[PDB]
């Protein structure tokens, strides 16, 4: 089909921690006699990979893009491929019109509490302009592993005005633990937060 090219942004995890972040480029839609070029960082070991699959695609990565990305500088990734004479162009920078997530941790409903088996904590992150968000959970000061909670994908909210996104996450915990007075937190990671993460902590006492 019609050959297409797009750039993929760096990992929100890597950027929010403040460590080195990989910036990736891929070729969708022929043998890999391919040579990539990058604009903003000159002679910085732009690494390639094998041709992963239907029709093949060659992946190109570029390390240490964090400071320029967060500065807002624009990354161009021109890729030469044998099938054509002249190459394709793809542009990607850090998003504008940023909004901070509003984070709400909602207590378990009366219905579940009464049944006194498992009760459900609902984390709602809402009103944030770049779709990309991290959601993590604490019980006490212990971080729960990913496998112990369910997080939905960030989806666009209704508005005629500004384009915001919302995400939900659901942690199921023993009625016992909730009734002992244990704390439960959801931590929301986002580019627009001045302290990288926002934390909301709920207990039965409030």
């Amino acid at each position, epitope marked *: 089909c019609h050959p297409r090219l797009s750039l993929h942004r760096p990992a929100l995890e890597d950027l929010l921690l403040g460590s080195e972040a990989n910036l990736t480029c891929t070729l969708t839609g022929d043998a890999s006699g391919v040579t990539f070029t990058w604009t903003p960082s000159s002679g910085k070991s732009a690494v390639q990979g094998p041709p992963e699959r239907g029709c093949y695609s060659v992946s190109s990565v570029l390390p240490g893009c964090a400071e320029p990305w967060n500065h807002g500088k624009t990354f161009t990734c021109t890729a030469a491929y044998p099938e054509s004479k002249t190459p394709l162009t793809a542009t990607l920078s850090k998003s504008g019109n940023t909004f901070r997530p509003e984070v709400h941790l909602l207590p378990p409903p009366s219905e579940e509490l009464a049944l006194n088996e498992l009760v459900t904590l609902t984390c709602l992150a809402r009103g944030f302009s770049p779709k990309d968000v991290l959601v993590r959970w604490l019980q006490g*000061s212990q971080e729960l592993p990913r496998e112990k909670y369910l997080t939905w994908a960030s989806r666009q909210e209704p508005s005629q005005g500004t384009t915001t996104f919302a995400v939900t996450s659901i942690l199921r915990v023993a009625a016992e633990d909730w009734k002992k007075g244990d704390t439960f937190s959801c931590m929301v*990671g986002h580019e627009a937060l001045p302290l990288a993460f926002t934390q909301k902590t709920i207990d039965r006492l409030a």
Partner: antibody
Amino acid sequence: EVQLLESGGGLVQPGGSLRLSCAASGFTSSNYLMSWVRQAPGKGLEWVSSIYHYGHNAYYADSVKGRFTISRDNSKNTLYLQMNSLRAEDTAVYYCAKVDSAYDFGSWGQGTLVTVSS
Amino acid sequence: SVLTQPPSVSGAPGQRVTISCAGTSSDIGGRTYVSWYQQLPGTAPKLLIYKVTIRASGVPDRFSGSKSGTSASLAITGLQAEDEADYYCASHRSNNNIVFGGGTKLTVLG
């Protein structure tokens, strides 16, 4: 094995500022609740500051509020306490501590003595 | 403020002794985030008990913790001269502080 090495301690004049560092090993200080806890010579343990997992969301004792700042630098895996407008009452061994599951100081450094004196 | 501990307790060898820790509804009352630390002279504090009742690894069963309303207490059985140390309780408080007790100097008689 988890290890915490405090450094930065020494003499500072009243009203002066000091920076304590705390190098973490055998764990990632970003992935845990990290704290500074202080003990004036002869006296009891006083929690100073906490910094929660991943972010820069900090809490402070009121004895220390508007003066001290708990920082974290993930590239070096070190915890900081910026101390300003220091007083005789801030003379203490400063411990950095890793919190486990239940707001419990599971792993402690050896401590660094800040002396506030003319 | 500070969680209220007795400045000292004492016991004979082989005795059971208790160290009390009196807090508020914002800390020990309603929650189970009460920890106990042993501080031998010179050395940094060592966690004995966390979550009111749970021993840290290495800590013998001689050491045990309990809670009742707004106060918790550490309990030591088969008391040995080895147990001579300062003992601090701590607790999470509603204001996202960790509040320590005044500390208790434990003496073994005879």
